Amino acid sequence: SMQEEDTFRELRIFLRNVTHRLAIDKRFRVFTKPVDPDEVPDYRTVIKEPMDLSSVISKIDLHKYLTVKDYLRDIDLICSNALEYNPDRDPGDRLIRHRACALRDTAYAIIKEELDEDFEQLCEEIQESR
Numbered sequence: 001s002m003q004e005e006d007t008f009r010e011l012r013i014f015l016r017n018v019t020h021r022l023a024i025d026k027r028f029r030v031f032t033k034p035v036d037p038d039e040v041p042d043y044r045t046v047i048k049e050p051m052d053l054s055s056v057i058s059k060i061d062l063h064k065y066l067t068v069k070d071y072l073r074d075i076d077l078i079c080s081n082a083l084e085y086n087p088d089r090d091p092g093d094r095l096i097r098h099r100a101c102a103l104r105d106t107a108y109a110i111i112k113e114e115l116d117e118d119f120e121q122l123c124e125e126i127q128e129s130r
């Protein structure tokens with residue numbers, strides 16, 4: 001219905017606003033673009049599904065997310081990719097892991113304060129009807 005297409009348009013406006021607020025935070029610059037395959041050639045042999053905040057906006061505009069749950073699966077993949085590629089005790093690996101955990105925790109905290117639980121349940125019920 002038109003009403004259902006209006007629901008998904010509100011979901012996309014909400015997701016673009018959360019993603020912009022993450023992308024302007026200086027702590028998260030290392031997640032604003034794909035890991036460069038010329039600078040890091042072993043990256044795409046270790047990490048089987050690369051993800052970053054530029055790719056997330058492209059996916060919102062392609063209508064890939066029909067719930068906040070499917071958006072948070074991609075924020076969780078950015079975080080898990082950084083923990084698995086950079087696992088060592090040295091400071092550069094510890095700094096990127098701390099930033100990855102802060103990106104995940106920040107996204108979940110904005111959604112807990114600003115997403116209405118009944119708006120998410122409406123998106124889930126339209127998705128399950130298709």
Ligand SMILES: COC(=O)N1C[C@@H]2C[C@@H]3O[C@]2(Cc2[nH]cnc23)C1
Nearest residue numbers: 030031035039040081082085086096
């Ligand atoms: C999310 O970003 C990462 O997982 N990274 C892996 C790399 C390791 C380290 O930071 C890079 C880029 C780079 N070039 C030279 N060393 C590095 C970004």
